[PDB]
Nucleic acid binder design. Structure first.
Lengths: 116, 149
RNA sequence: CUUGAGUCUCGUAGAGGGGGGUAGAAUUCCAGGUGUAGCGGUGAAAUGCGUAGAGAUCUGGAGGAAUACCGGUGGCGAAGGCGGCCCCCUGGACGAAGACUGACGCUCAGGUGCGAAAGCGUGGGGAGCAAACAGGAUUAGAUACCCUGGUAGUCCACGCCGUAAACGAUGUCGACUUGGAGGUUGUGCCCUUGAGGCGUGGCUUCCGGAGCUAACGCGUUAAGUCGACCGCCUGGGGAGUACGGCCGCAAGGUUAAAACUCAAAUGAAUUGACGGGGGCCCGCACAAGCGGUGGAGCAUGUGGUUUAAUUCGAUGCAACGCGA
């Protein structure tokens, strides 16, 4: 729609999945596409190359807003997820800040059990 | 762990060419020095009969386009066998070039070894034959897949 | 008689307990938007939210849930245990000086009290998370992992029970003990001559010295040398088991056997193998290059086959131009 050229990106670096959402500084959704939404399933979707191709198929379709500079923060214990932000940097999204806002529990919610 | 210097070969007693002595040794089998000399010297004289000048640099200008620059050497690190492309030394480039030159002279399709090799020298001088084919073949397998380099 | 024990004055550190709300991330719900075909989770998959339009963030709010950042073998307590924030009542320890009592003290079967978690009764909340549980997906049964959901349950008051590797497997009160380095609470002397060095109190953590122990090991906090008191053990299995007594809404708990079986059971520390761990090197063992065995014909041996008999031995790198 409008011209942005400078926004922000929030990622959900899950264990077996990856979510991305780009926003223009106020909560408007611009770009978003997971791994399991482009015919990519199985462990093939669990590779950093899947993050590469997710970034690519986001960027080639969301340039309707014209973003050149981008803010981002790495979020989640995702294996190899700086690759997708470097692909954004390679997708024409000239990066401006790389930080981490991973929400750590404050022993407010009891952590669930894991594989025995 | 062992390391030594290259074998002290005697240069060619006629033209004084150590790199060509290395070639006439690469080619020689069963130690038939006399017949091997009598065929290669005659074929290189047939090279003077081919162009009509003092053929001494023609060998070098022909081999300038059959020397490789990239080689693959398999090294299994990290599960599978990686290819690890590595540069080839010029002193080994000359050897490999002469190897590709000699590994196509026998299947030329001429009357005799001397004749077919005299023809193949001029052939590789203008970038044709199995030698140049293998040169391009090794140039494309290595460093064109730099993701592994 | 006053050193033990207490009493007085002033301060130090504080996650000891109630009662109250309080702020931030988060995450279920509610509404408004902006935007679009997807989200959601598996070594894969499917289940499950979506075309009046799904997630996801923006604005705000309800719900309950515990306080990361200080966070520290860091502090506190008789033990069991305590962490956002503040207050009232207090529970305990320590420090700086000066003064009083007359032995008032330590231990302690019963008894009383406190007492991890799990397990109940009454009255409530229960957002998220999580024993059981429906069901889906590979499936001659998966009832076992993996995934979204989920009952008590964690939470809140009043009451039930008293069991743990409740361990420092080391009961309590004391007398005399060579050092170093730090954790934490002190404050004196002389010049605070930017946070100054020496002596003087405590509680502690990592090493070792004589000493003790079967060894490991303990070693100013003793498992060192001694004084006073309480509990526990007399081979293993049955077994902390039946029958009892008491307690208990229930689970059962406490005290607590015998007939029968065996000749062992058990702690430390060497020397050993497990079969892969983990690391360091040799050998044409590999990678680069040469001719080769395997393609073909012929000589020769081996197993089969054949026969009246086709004489015997030999068999993975070490059997097959081997005895010959």
């Amino acid at each position: 729609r409008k011209q942005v050229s400078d926004g922000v990106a929030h990622i959900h670096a899950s264990f077996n999945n990856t979510i991305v959402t780009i926003t223009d500084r106020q909560g408007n959704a611009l770009g978003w596409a997971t791994a399991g939404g482009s015919g990519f399933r199985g462990s093939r979707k669990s590779t950093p190359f899947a993050a590469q191709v997710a970034a690519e198929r986001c960027a080639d379709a969301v340039k309707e807003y014209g973003i050149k500079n981008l803010e981002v923060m790495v979020k989640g214990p995702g294996p190899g997820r700086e690759s997708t932000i470097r692909a954004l940097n390679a997708a024409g999204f000239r990066i401006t800040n790389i930080t981490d806002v991973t929400p750590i529990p404050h022993n407010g919610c009891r952590p669930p059990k894991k594989r025995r | 762990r062992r390391v030594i210097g290259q074998r002290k070969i005697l240069p060619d007693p006629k033209f004084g060419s150590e790199l060509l002595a290395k070639f006439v040794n690469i080619l020689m089998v069963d130690g038939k020095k006399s017949t091997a000399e009598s065929i290669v010297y005659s074929a290189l004289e047939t090279l003077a009969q081919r162009s009509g000048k003092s053929e001494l640099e023609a060998f070098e200008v022909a081999l300038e386009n059959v020397r490789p620059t990239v080689e693959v050497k398999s090294r299994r690190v990290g599960g599978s066998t990686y290819q690890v492309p590595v540069e080839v030394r010029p002193v080994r480039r000359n050897a490999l070039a002469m190897r590709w030159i000699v590994e196509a002279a026998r299947k030329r399709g001429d009357k005799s070894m001397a004749l077919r090799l005299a023809n193949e020298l001029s052939d590789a001088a203008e970038n044709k034959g199995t030698a140049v084919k293998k040169r391009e073949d090794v140039h494309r397998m290595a460093e064109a897949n730099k993701a592994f380099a």
